[model samples]
Target: NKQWYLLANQLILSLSKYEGGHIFEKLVDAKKQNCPDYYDVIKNPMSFSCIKTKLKKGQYAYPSEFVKDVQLIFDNCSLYNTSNSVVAITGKNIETYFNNQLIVMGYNNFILKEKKINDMLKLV
Candidate 1:
């Protein structure tokens, strides 16, 4: 598939720059030897991980920001369509499974009940 091919190419390019040792060493050495501003241009680290602390505690504050970033990345890259059989077996509408009000109510009730039970257990 074209998408798969493009994805593979992107992966190879990334690996060559970051983790492909011999190839990356040769490329860096050639750049340093040939280009005057190579060090200046390549000074920044290629990758960084930003921690989303709010998400760790199950807050939804980052969803919109996360979705925007994900959509931008997806738009820049090619994506493959799965086979019909695979779709039939695995496809689902995520929203159908997530009712925010229901989840909040359930969690709140569970916490309240758990606290009461624990209090009684302690008394016993």
Candidate 2:
């Protein structure tokens, strides 16, 4: 449960970095309104950071399943109603949900690493 909360925190942090700061606060507040239990756990800064790093750099060969897991937690937990509402508003501009955005951004960064690999391949 703490782990899940941490993931939510990280998702909020990541979104704030790429999107905006208040977004996470709004989400957190919303979660508090709907699911105080989960929100309380996520309020920890350390937990939030842990999840943020993972989200920023985590790998994903096929991320859909992973995304589903995150979404499932987001939906069923009842901690995210307000968060979801904010997400619905901001998500309109975002191509993907928060978790998916993290994965996609991470994947793109990985692809960037291939630039060096491709350069090396050309030299070979």
Candidate 3:
């Protein structure tokens, strides 16, 4: 239903207000942030800024598109940062929060199914 669109907006808003959200709410600045290799390391970068902009522009017609972009934020974080680093851990925690939010919004089936697919695809 169209309610998913509203829920997605709410999710983004909530994430913006989450703890340490300041770091995730905007795109990473490789130069200003002093991570020269950021662009080289993370090919598909994502941030709340781009996601919100896409939502406002009505670029997301389905929940999966929005979910994919949002998940990319965490995926890029993990891909660019070391596993035990603060940034990596923050991404992990936020991803958990994001999944829980999806479940609470009645997107549990999508989450479970997506996880199953990912698990199976790991061997590919």
Candidate 4:
């Protein structure tokens, strides 16, 4: 019985549907970093929130896009001044960076050094 179940499960993983594709894959298309849901984006799309795209027919969007999109949104909120419309924006210190930028925009309770942000680039 266990052996039969194993083969059945394998088949299920590979089975793709037109409406949602692989069953397991769809469970994770929930969100992108600073971005929002694909379905929500579909319902109401925005340039900044849709910071996700696909390069392959085989890859899923959540792990690919959700993971990538968060950082870009954070950078847009904290860095990129001339290149991006939103960034390092604090006319409002704790006023913004401590109170707003890292917490609200980065969605992080932990503060990452700007150098550490640079280090993430070196990791590539």
Query: Model 4, stretches more than 4 Å misplaced?
Result: 1-47, 52-64, 82-124
Which ranking of candidates, highest TM-score first?
Answer: 3, 2, 4, 1
Q: Worst lDDT window (10 residues) for model 3?
A: 106-115
Q: What is the C-alpha lDDT profile of model 2 across 1-124, one tens digit per residue?
A: 2343344445555645666334333334545557556545544322223334545565322333334434433343333335557654454433255647656456434334545766899999
Residue 40 of model 2: what lDDT? 52
lDDT of 3 at 22: 67
Off by over 4 Å in 3: 109-124
Q: Backbone clash tally for model 3?
A: 0
lDDT for 97 (candidate 2): 58
Task: Provide the global lDDT of candidate 3 against the true structure.
Answer: 0.84
Pairs with backbone N, CA or C atoms under 3 Å apart (clashes), candidate 1: none
Which regions in candidate 2 have their CA more than 4 angstroms from the true location? 1-14, 25-48, 53-79, 82-84, 91-124
In candidate 1, stretches whose alpha carbon ends up further than 4 angstroms from where it belongs are: 1-105
Whole-model lDDT per candidate: 0.31, 0.45, 0.84, 0.31
Candidate 2 pairs with clashing backbones: none
Mind giving the per-residue lDDT tens digits that candidate 4 earns over 40-78? 534422222132122223233222233233333333333
Error of 2 at 86 (Å): 3.7
Per-residue lDDT of 27 in model 2: 35
The residue-by-residue lDDT of candidate 1 on 20-76, one tens digit each, is: 212222223425556465445444211111112222333333223322322222222
| Candidate 4 lDDT for residue 120 | 96
